[PDB]
Amino acid sequence: GPHMDYLATREKEKGNEAFNSGDYEEAVMYYTRSISALPTVVAYNNRAQAYIKLQNWNSAEQDCEKVLELEPGNVKALLRRATAYKHQNKLREAREDLKKVLKVEPDNDLAKKTLSEVERDLKNSE
């Protein structure tokens, strides 16, 4: 119906109640209701972040790709897409994504500390 934004933030707040409590699988479905009412960078990026703790890397990339269509350059989405790639053995794409973070935010520990593991894992991936 109308006012789909009003529940798209409130269902996300129920997801954040579950996420801080340690029910990430309950957080994913709460964010999925949210995106089907009003799709946001916030709900896609948080859905992908919950999937990382569920080991659902190939689901997590699909919501990260949607973030890059709204915010082309989003550091959180590139950090999470590169993390999903690292665990999918898609490191060949992750090296590039961590560089797209570090050009804007050279302070990102999660970017540079993962890059040092990606560069060696590529040299091992023969």
Side-chain angles (χ1 to χ4, degrees), residues 4 8 31 33-44 66 70:
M4 304 215 79
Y31 302 136
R33 303 193 87 225
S34 307
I35 301 155
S36 298
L38 204 308
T40 33
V41 169
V42 173
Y44 284 129
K66 303 295 88 167
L70 297 149

Side-chain angles (χ1 to χ4, degrees), residues 8-21:
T9 187
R10 287 174 176 274
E11 299 295 300
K12 166 214 66 174
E13 295 234 274
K14 315 314 185 174
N16 288 339
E17 297 243 292
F19 180 96
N20 89 95
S21 191

Side-chain angles (χ1 to χ4, degrees), residues 4 19 29 42 47 54 58 62 65 74-75 86 89 93 98-100 105 114 121:
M4 304 215 79
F19 180 96
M29 49 145 259
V42 173
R47 190 178 187 227
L54 281 33
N58 180 236
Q62 315 302 333
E65 296 275 34
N74 187 275
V75 167
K86 204 306 193 196
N89 231 257
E93 286 196 82
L98 298 157
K99 288 173 61 187
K100 309 217 297 184
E105 296 293 329
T114 306
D121 272 3

Side-chain angles (χ1 to χ4, degrees), residues 24-89:
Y24 280 50
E25 293 193 69
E26 301 281 276
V28 182
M29 49 145 259
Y30 282 132
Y31 302 136
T32 311
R33 303 193 87 225
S34 307
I35 301 155
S36 298
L38 204 308
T40 33
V41 169
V42 173
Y44 284 129
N45 215 344
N46 282 300
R47 190 178 187 227
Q49 185 56 103
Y51 276 144
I52 284 176
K53 267 57 173 65
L54 281 33
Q55 306 173 247
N56 271 244
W57 319 108
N58 180 236
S59 303
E61 65 172 291
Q62 315 302 333
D63 294 296
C64 295
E65 296 275 34
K66 303 295 88 167
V67 179
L68 273 306
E69 298 182 314
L70 297 149
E71 280 190 6
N74 187 275
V75 167
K76 269 49 154 54
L78 291 165
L79 281 173
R80 291 167 187 163
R81 199 170 69 172
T83 295
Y85 288 158
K86 204 306 193 196
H87 295 292
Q88 288 190 71
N89 231 257

